[PDB]
Design a binder for this molecule. Structure first.
Ligand SMILES: N[C@H](C(=O)O)[C@H](OCc1ccccc1)C(=O)O
Ligand code: NA
Ligand code: NA
Length: 416
Protein backbone atom coordinates (compact mmCIF):
# COMPACT_ATOMS: atom_id res chain seq x y z
CA UNK A 1 0.00 0.00 0.00
CA UNK A 2 1.75 3.11 1.31
CA UNK A 3 5.13 1.41 0.84
CA UNK A 4 5.12 2.34 -2.86
CA UNK A 5 4.19 6.00 -2.34
CA UNK A 6 7.35 6.43 -0.27
CA UNK A 7 9.37 5.24 -3.28
CA UNK A 8 8.20 7.51 -6.11
CA UNK A 9 8.63 10.57 -3.90
CA UNK A 10 11.93 12.33 -4.74
CA UNK A 11 14.82 11.17 -2.58
CA UNK A 12 16.40 14.59 -2.07
CA UNK A 13 13.21 16.15 -0.71
CA UNK A 14 12.91 13.29 1.78
CA UNK A 15 16.43 14.02 3.05
CA UNK A 16 15.57 17.69 3.67
CA UNK A 17 12.50 16.68 5.67
CA UNK A 18 14.65 14.48 7.90
CA UNK A 19 17.44 17.04 8.24
CA UNK A 20 15.13 19.87 9.33
CA UNK A 21 13.14 17.61 11.66
CA UNK A 22 16.31 16.19 13.20
CA UNK A 23 17.65 19.60 14.19
CA UNK A 24 14.28 20.75 15.57
CA UNK A 25 13.59 17.59 17.57
CA UNK A 26 17.18 17.40 18.80
CA UNK A 27 17.09 20.85 20.39
CA UNK A 28 13.72 20.24 22.06
CA UNK A 29 14.73 16.96 23.70
CA UNK A 30 18.09 18.38 24.77
CA UNK A 31 16.44 21.32 26.53
CA UNK A 32 14.24 19.02 28.64
CA UNK A 33 17.12 16.71 29.59
CA UNK A 34 16.25 13.66 27.46
CA UNK A 35 19.72 13.21 25.94
CA UNK A 36 20.06 9.66 27.30
CA UNK A 37 16.86 8.59 25.52
CA UNK A 38 18.20 9.82 22.18
CA UNK A 39 21.56 8.13 22.74
CA UNK A 40 20.05 4.77 23.70
CA UNK A 41 17.42 4.34 20.97
CA UNK A 42 17.63 7.03 18.27
CA UNK A 43 21.39 6.76 17.68
CA UNK A 44 21.56 3.05 16.63
CA UNK A 45 19.45 3.74 13.53
CA UNK A 46 21.89 6.48 12.53
CA UNK A 47 24.89 4.20 13.07
CA UNK A 48 23.35 1.66 10.69
CA UNK A 49 23.41 4.16 7.81
CA UNK A 50 27.11 4.98 8.11
CA UNK A 51 28.06 1.29 8.35
CA UNK A 52 26.24 0.58 5.08
CA UNK A 53 28.20 3.27 3.22
CA UNK A 54 31.60 2.20 4.58
CA UNK A 55 30.92 -1.38 3.47
CA UNK A 56 30.96 -0.44 -0.23
CA UNK A 57 34.14 1.67 -0.16
CA UNK A 58 36.71 -1.11 -0.60
CA UNK A 59 35.04 -3.13 -3.42
CA UNK A 60 34.06 -0.03 -5.40
CA UNK A 61 37.55 1.51 -5.30
CA UNK A 62 39.48 -1.57 -6.45
CA UNK A 63 37.05 -2.43 -9.25
CA UNK A 64 36.78 1.11 -10.62
CA UNK A 65 40.53 1.71 -10.99
CA UNK A 66 41.11 -1.59 -12.81
CA UNK A 67 38.38 -0.80 -15.34
CA UNK A 68 39.26 2.89 -15.43
CA UNK A 69 43.00 2.44 -15.95
CA UNK A 70 42.40 -0.09 -18.73
CA UNK A 71 40.34 2.35 -20.80
CA UNK A 72 42.84 5.22 -20.55
CA UNK A 73 46.25 5.19 -22.20
CA UNK A 74 49.32 5.09 -19.93
CA UNK A 75 50.63 8.39 -21.30
CA UNK A 76 47.38 10.26 -20.61
CA UNK A 77 47.23 8.91 -17.04
CA UNK A 78 50.52 10.65 -16.29
CA UNK A 79 49.21 14.03 -17.44
CA UNK A 80 46.05 13.62 -15.34
CA UNK A 81 48.05 12.77 -12.22
CA UNK A 82 50.40 15.76 -12.35
CA UNK A 83 47.57 18.23 -13.02
CA UNK A 84 45.46 17.08 -10.06
CA UNK A 85 48.40 17.16 -7.63
CA UNK A 86 49.19 20.78 -8.50
CA UNK A 87 45.52 21.71 -8.12
CA UNK A 88 45.26 20.19 -4.64
CA UNK A 89 48.28 22.06 -3.24
CA UNK A 90 47.19 25.47 -4.53
CA UNK A 91 43.60 25.23 -3.30
CA UNK A 92 44.59 23.92 0.14
CA UNK A 93 47.23 26.64 0.51
CA UNK A 94 44.74 29.41 -0.27
CA UNK A 95 42.16 27.90 2.10
CA UNK A 96 44.57 28.32 5.03
CA UNK A 97 45.15 31.97 4.09
CA UNK A 98 41.39 32.61 3.97
CA UNK A 99 41.04 31.14 7.46
CA UNK A 100 43.72 33.46 8.82
CA UNK A 101 41.86 36.53 7.53
CA UNK A 102 38.56 35.47 9.10
CA UNK A 103 40.19 34.85 12.50
CA UNK A 104 41.64 38.37 12.59
CA UNK A 105 38.31 40.03 11.81
CA UNK A 106 36.27 38.13 14.40
CA UNK A 107 39.11 37.87 16.97
CA UNK A 108 37.76 34.85 18.89
CA UNK A 109 38.76 33.88 22.40
CA UNK A 110 39.92 37.32 23.51
CA UNK A 111 39.02 36.82 27.17
CA UNK A 112 37.91 33.20 27.49
CA UNK A 113 38.34 31.65 30.93
CA UNK A 114 41.27 29.27 31.40
CA UNK A 115 41.12 26.42 33.92
CA UNK A 116 43.52 23.55 34.55
CA UNK A 117 42.08 20.19 33.56
CA UNK A 118 42.89 16.89 31.89
CA UNK A 119 46.25 16.95 30.12
CA UNK A 120 46.53 15.67 26.56
CA UNK A 121 49.02 12.91 25.86
CA UNK A 122 52.35 13.57 24.17
CA UNK A 123 51.63 14.33 20.49
CA UNK A 124 52.23 11.46 18.10
CA UNK A 125 55.45 11.83 16.13
CA UNK A 126 54.80 11.96 12.40
CA UNK A 127 56.52 9.17 10.44
CA UNK A 128 59.43 10.28 8.26
CA UNK A 129 58.53 11.33 4.73
CA UNK A 130 60.57 8.46 3.26
CA UNK A 131 58.42 5.98 5.18
CA UNK A 132 55.22 7.61 3.91
CA UNK A 133 56.30 7.35 0.27
CA UNK A 134 57.60 3.79 0.56
CA UNK A 135 54.30 2.64 2.10
CA UNK A 136 52.44 3.23 -1.18
CA UNK A 137 53.78 -0.09 -2.50
CA UNK A 138 51.86 -2.90 -0.75
CA UNK A 139 53.90 -5.87 0.45
CA UNK A 140 50.79 -8.09 0.25
CA UNK A 141 48.08 -7.00 -2.23
CA UNK A 142 45.46 -9.09 -0.43
CA UNK A 143 46.49 -7.68 2.95
CA UNK A 144 45.84 -4.12 1.80
CA UNK A 145 42.26 -4.95 0.80
CA UNK A 146 41.59 -6.79 4.06
CA UNK A 147 43.05 -3.99 6.20
CA UNK A 148 41.26 -1.24 4.26
CA UNK A 149 44.33 0.74 3.17
CA UNK A 150 43.14 3.02 0.38
CA UNK A 151 46.47 4.37 -0.85
CA UNK A 152 48.27 1.01 -1.35
CA UNK A 153 45.12 -0.33 -3.03
CA UNK A 154 45.21 2.42 -5.67
CA UNK A 155 48.80 1.58 -6.64
CA UNK A 156 48.13 -2.12 -7.22
CA UNK A 157 44.89 -1.53 -9.13
CA UNK A 158 46.48 0.90 -11.60
CA UNK A 159 49.36 -1.39 -12.59
CA UNK A 160 47.00 -4.38 -12.84
CA UNK A 161 44.74 -2.50 -15.25
CA UNK A 162 47.68 -1.42 -17.41
CA UNK A 163 49.01 -4.98 -17.65
CA UNK A 164 45.62 -6.27 -18.83
CA UNK A 165 45.61 -3.94 -21.84
CA UNK A 166 48.95 -5.30 -23.06
CA UNK A 167 47.61 -8.86 -22.78
CA UNK A 168 44.55 -7.99 -24.88
CA UNK A 169 46.86 -6.81 -27.69
CA UNK A 170 48.82 -10.08 -27.82
CA UNK A 171 48.89 -12.36 -30.87
CA UNK A 172 47.94 -15.46 -28.85
CA UNK A 173 44.22 -16.27 -28.82
CA UNK A 174 44.36 -18.08 -25.47
CA UNK A 175 46.03 -15.13 -23.74
CA UNK A 176 43.53 -12.68 -25.25
CA UNK A 177 40.51 -14.75 -24.21
CA UNK A 178 41.75 -15.06 -20.62
CA UNK A 179 42.38 -11.32 -20.33
CA UNK A 180 38.88 -10.39 -21.52
CA UNK A 181 37.27 -12.88 -19.14
CA UNK A 182 39.13 -11.41 -16.16
CA UNK A 183 38.22 -7.84 -17.14
CA UNK A 184 34.54 -8.68 -17.62
CA UNK A 185 34.30 -10.30 -14.18
CA UNK A 186 35.85 -7.26 -12.50
CA UNK A 187 33.61 -4.92 -14.51
CA UNK A 188 30.53 -6.80 -13.34
CA UNK A 189 31.58 -6.34 -9.71
CA UNK A 190 31.85 -2.57 -10.18
CA UNK A 191 28.39 -2.34 -11.78
CA UNK A 192 26.83 -4.33 -8.94
CA UNK A 193 28.26 -1.90 -6.38
CA UNK A 194 26.55 1.08 -8.03
CA UNK A 195 23.21 -0.74 -7.96
CA UNK A 196 23.51 -1.22 -4.19
CA UNK A 197 24.25 2.49 -3.71
CA UNK A 198 20.83 3.39 -5.11
CA UNK A 199 19.12 1.17 -2.54
CA UNK A 200 21.10 2.66 0.34
CA UNK A 201 19.93 6.22 -0.36
CA UNK A 202 16.34 5.03 0.08
CA UNK A 203 17.18 4.44 3.76
CA UNK A 204 19.06 7.76 3.95
CA UNK A 205 16.03 9.82 5.16
CA UNK A 206 15.87 7.68 8.30
CA UNK A 207 19.63 7.76 8.82
CA UNK A 208 20.03 11.53 8.52
CA UNK A 209 17.25 12.12 11.07
CA UNK A 210 19.00 10.14 13.81
CA UNK A 211 22.50 11.56 13.37
CA UNK A 212 21.42 15.21 13.52
CA UNK A 213 19.09 14.63 16.48
CA UNK A 214 21.83 13.01 18.58
CA UNK A 215 24.50 15.67 18.02
CA UNK A 216 22.20 18.67 18.55
CA UNK A 217 20.72 17.28 21.78
CA UNK A 218 24.11 16.63 23.39
CA UNK A 219 26.37 19.27 21.81
CA UNK A 220 24.24 22.05 20.31
CA UNK A 221 23.69 23.68 23.71
CA UNK A 222 27.38 24.55 24.16
CA UNK A 223 27.37 26.87 21.13
CA UNK A 224 26.36 29.83 23.31
CA UNK A 225 29.24 31.90 24.65
CA UNK A 226 32.65 32.70 23.21
CA UNK A 227 32.49 29.48 21.17
CA UNK A 228 29.70 31.06 19.11
CA UNK A 229 32.22 33.47 17.57
CA UNK A 230 34.45 30.54 16.58
CA UNK A 231 31.54 28.81 14.82
CA UNK A 232 30.63 32.02 13.00
CA UNK A 233 34.20 32.54 11.80
CA UNK A 234 34.58 29.00 10.45
CA UNK A 235 31.23 28.73 8.66
CA UNK A 236 31.51 32.15 7.02
CA UNK A 237 34.98 31.14 5.87
CA UNK A 238 33.64 27.85 4.53
CA UNK A 239 30.92 29.71 2.62
CA UNK A 240 33.53 31.98 1.03
CA UNK A 241 35.70 29.01 0.03
CA UNK A 242 32.88 27.45 -2.00
CA UNK A 243 31.93 30.73 -3.68
CA UNK A 244 35.08 32.86 -3.83
CA UNK A 245 37.35 30.00 -4.91
CA UNK A 246 35.52 27.19 -6.69
CA UNK A 247 32.96 29.28 -8.58
CA UNK A 248 35.64 31.67 -9.85
CA UNK A 249 37.79 28.82 -11.19
CA UNK A 250 34.76 27.20 -12.84
CA UNK A 251 33.95 30.47 -14.62
CA UNK A 252 37.56 30.81 -15.81
CA UNK A 253 37.61 27.32 -17.35
CA UNK A 254 34.16 27.66 -18.92
CA UNK A 255 32.28 25.20 -16.70
CA UNK A 256 28.79 26.43 -15.85
CA UNK A 257 28.44 26.81 -12.05
CA UNK A 258 24.65 26.38 -12.20
CA UNK A 259 24.81 23.14 -14.20
CA UNK A 260 27.59 21.75 -11.99
CA UNK A 261 25.84 22.53 -8.69
CA UNK A 262 22.63 20.80 -9.80
CA UNK A 263 24.39 17.45 -10.26
CA UNK A 264 26.57 17.76 -7.15
CA UNK A 265 23.76 18.58 -4.71
CA UNK A 266 23.37 14.91 -3.75
CA UNK A 267 27.06 14.41 -2.95
CA UNK A 268 27.44 17.70 -1.06
CA UNK A 269 24.47 17.11 1.23
CA UNK A 270 25.24 13.51 2.23
CA UNK A 271 28.75 14.50 3.31
CA UNK A 272 27.33 17.09 5.72
CA UNK A 273 25.42 14.50 7.76
CA UNK A 274 27.87 11.59 7.62
CA UNK A 275 30.98 13.78 8.11
CA UNK A 276 33.15 11.12 6.44
CA UNK A 277 34.83 11.75 3.09
CA UNK A 278 35.65 8.06 2.65
CA UNK A 279 32.07 7.03 3.40
CA UNK A 280 30.78 9.56 0.85
CA UNK A 281 32.95 8.10 -1.94
CA UNK A 282 30.27 5.69 -3.30
CA UNK A 283 27.85 8.62 -3.64
CA UNK A 284 30.51 11.00 -4.99
CA UNK A 285 31.67 8.57 -7.68
CA UNK A 286 28.05 7.98 -8.73
CA UNK A 287 27.60 11.74 -9.18
CA UNK A 288 30.75 12.05 -11.31
CA UNK A 289 29.57 9.59 -13.97
CA UNK A 290 26.21 11.37 -14.21
CA UNK A 291 27.86 14.59 -15.42
CA UNK A 292 29.54 12.63 -18.23
CA UNK A 293 33.11 12.55 -16.93
CA UNK A 294 35.30 9.91 -18.55
CA UNK A 295 35.73 6.66 -16.63
CA UNK A 296 39.52 6.91 -16.53
CA UNK A 297 39.45 10.44 -15.12
CA UNK A 298 37.13 10.30 -12.11
CA UNK A 299 38.16 6.76 -11.14
CA UNK A 300 41.61 8.02 -10.08
CA UNK A 301 41.11 11.64 -8.99
CA UNK A 302 38.25 11.13 -6.53
CA UNK A 303 39.80 8.32 -4.41
CA UNK A 304 43.08 10.24 -4.19
CA UNK A 305 41.32 13.51 -3.35
CA UNK A 306 39.57 11.93 -0.37
CA UNK A 307 42.88 10.95 1.23
CA UNK A 308 45.04 14.05 0.67
CA UNK A 309 42.77 16.95 -0.34
CA UNK A 310 41.55 18.64 2.87
CA UNK A 311 40.34 22.14 2.01
CA UNK A 312 37.78 22.58 4.79
CA UNK A 313 40.07 20.87 7.28
CA UNK A 314 42.91 23.24 6.36
CA UNK A 315 40.77 26.28 7.16
CA UNK A 316 39.85 24.73 10.52
CA UNK A 317 43.51 24.53 11.53
CA UNK A 318 44.14 28.16 10.58
CA UNK A 319 41.22 29.52 12.60
CA UNK A 320 41.89 27.27 15.60
CA UNK A 321 45.53 28.40 15.79
CA UNK A 322 44.56 32.02 16.45
CA UNK A 323 42.03 31.01 19.12
CA UNK A 324 44.69 29.27 21.23
CA UNK A 325 47.04 32.26 21.05
CA UNK A 326 44.27 34.76 21.84
CA UNK A 327 43.41 32.76 24.96
CA UNK A 328 47.02 33.08 26.14
CA UNK A 329 47.28 36.67 24.91
CA UNK A 330 50.17 35.87 22.56
CA UNK A 331 50.65 37.93 19.40
CA UNK A 332 51.38 36.43 15.98
CA UNK A 333 53.99 38.15 13.83
CA UNK A 334 53.41 38.50 10.09
CA UNK A 335 56.39 36.21 9.54
CA UNK A 336 54.87 33.63 11.89
CA UNK A 337 51.57 33.73 9.98
CA UNK A 338 53.37 32.71 6.78
CA UNK A 339 54.85 29.77 8.70
CA UNK A 340 51.33 28.45 9.33
CA UNK A 341 50.53 28.35 5.61
CA UNK A 342 53.66 26.37 4.76
CA UNK A 343 53.22 23.99 7.71
CA UNK A 344 49.58 23.20 6.88
CA UNK A 345 50.32 22.32 3.24
CA UNK A 346 53.23 20.02 4.12
CA UNK A 347 51.25 18.27 6.87
CA UNK A 348 48.38 17.53 4.46
CA UNK A 349 50.60 15.37 2.23
CA UNK A 350 53.00 14.44 5.04
CA UNK A 351 50.30 12.47 6.87
CA UNK A 352 48.77 10.57 3.95
CA UNK A 353 47.22 7.27 5.05
CA UNK A 354 48.01 7.50 8.77
CA UNK A 355 45.03 6.80 11.07
CA UNK A 356 43.45 9.82 12.72
CA UNK A 357 45.60 12.35 10.88
CA UNK A 358 43.45 15.22 12.19
CA UNK A 359 45.10 15.19 15.61
CA UNK A 360 48.63 14.98 14.19
CA UNK A 361 48.18 17.81 11.67
CA UNK A 362 46.85 20.25 14.27
CA UNK A 363 49.65 19.34 16.69
CA UNK A 364 52.29 19.96 14.02
CA UNK A 365 50.96 23.46 13.30
CA UNK A 366 50.92 24.37 17.00
CA UNK A 367 54.50 23.13 17.41
CA UNK A 368 55.68 25.17 14.42
CA UNK A 369 54.46 28.53 15.78
CA UNK A 370 56.20 27.98 19.12
CA UNK A 371 53.23 26.71 21.14
CA UNK A 372 53.80 23.01 21.92
CA UNK A 373 50.76 21.01 23.01
CA UNK A 374 52.74 19.62 25.96
CA UNK A 375 52.21 22.96 27.71
CA UNK A 376 49.44 22.41 30.30
CA UNK A 377 47.79 25.78 29.61
CA UNK A 378 47.34 25.26 25.86
CA UNK A 379 45.82 21.85 26.61
CA UNK A 380 42.94 23.51 28.47
CA UNK A 381 42.40 25.87 25.53
CA UNK A 382 42.65 22.90 23.16
CA UNK A 383 40.00 20.98 25.13
CA UNK A 384 37.61 23.91 24.64
CA UNK A 385 37.34 23.70 20.85
CA UNK A 386 36.79 19.95 21.09
CA UNK A 387 33.58 20.79 22.93
CA UNK A 388 32.14 22.05 19.63
CA UNK A 389 34.31 19.89 17.34
CA UNK A 390 31.41 17.66 16.25
CA UNK A 391 29.28 20.62 15.15
CA UNK A 392 32.20 22.10 13.20
CA UNK A 393 32.94 18.62 11.82
CA UNK A 394 29.56 18.54 10.04
CA UNK A 395 30.35 21.62 7.96
CA UNK A 396 34.05 20.86 7.61
CA UNK A 397 33.46 17.68 5.58
CA UNK A 398 31.19 19.41 3.05
CA UNK A 399 34.02 21.63 1.78
CA UNK A 400 36.39 18.65 1.48
CA UNK A 401 34.07 16.77 -0.88
CA UNK A 402 33.27 19.92 -2.88
CA UNK A 403 36.96 20.52 -3.60
CA UNK A 404 37.31 16.98 -4.97
CA UNK A 405 34.42 17.33 -7.43
CA UNK A 406 35.45 20.81 -8.58
CA UNK A 407 38.95 19.64 -9.49
CA UNK A 408 37.63 16.64 -11.41
CA UNK A 409 35.54 18.85 -13.71
CA UNK A 410 38.48 21.19 -14.42
CA UNK A 411 40.76 18.34 -15.47
CA UNK A 412 37.95 16.68 -17.43
CA UNK A 413 37.32 19.86 -19.43
CA UNK A 414 41.03 20.18 -20.21
CA UNK A 415 41.06 16.52 -21.30
CA UNK A 416 38.93 17.23 -24.37
N1 LIG B 1 35.90 14.67 9.19
C1 LIG B 1 36.60 14.95 7.95
C2 LIG B 1 36.76 13.67 7.14
O1 LIG B 1 36.21 12.60 7.53
O2 LIG B 1 37.43 13.66 6.08
C3 LIG B 1 37.97 15.55 8.25
O3 LIG B 1 38.92 14.53 8.43
C4 LIG B 1 39.06 14.03 9.73
C5 LIG B 1 39.85 12.73 9.69
C6 LIG B 1 39.26 11.55 10.12
C7 LIG B 1 39.97 10.36 10.09
C8 LIG B 1 41.28 10.35 9.62
C9 LIG B 1 41.86 11.53 9.19
C10 LIG B 1 41.15 12.72 9.23
C11 LIG B 1 37.90 16.46 9.48
O4 LIG B 1 38.88 17.18 9.79
O5 LIG B 1 36.85 16.50 10.17
NA1 NA C 1 43.12 20.89 -2.58
NA1 NA D 1 38.85 16.71 -0.55
Amino acid sequence: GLYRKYIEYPVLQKILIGLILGAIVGLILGHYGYAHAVHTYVKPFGDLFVRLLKMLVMPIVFASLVVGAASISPARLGRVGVKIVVYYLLTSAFAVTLGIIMARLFNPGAGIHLAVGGQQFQPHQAPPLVHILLDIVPTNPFGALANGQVLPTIFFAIILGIAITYLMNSENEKVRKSAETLLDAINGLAEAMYKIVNGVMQYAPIGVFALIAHVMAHQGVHVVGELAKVTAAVYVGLTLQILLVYFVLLKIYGIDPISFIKHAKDAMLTAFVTSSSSGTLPVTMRVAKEMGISEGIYSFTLPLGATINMDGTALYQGVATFFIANALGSHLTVGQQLTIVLTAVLASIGTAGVPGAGAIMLAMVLHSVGLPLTDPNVAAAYACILGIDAILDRGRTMVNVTGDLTGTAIVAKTEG
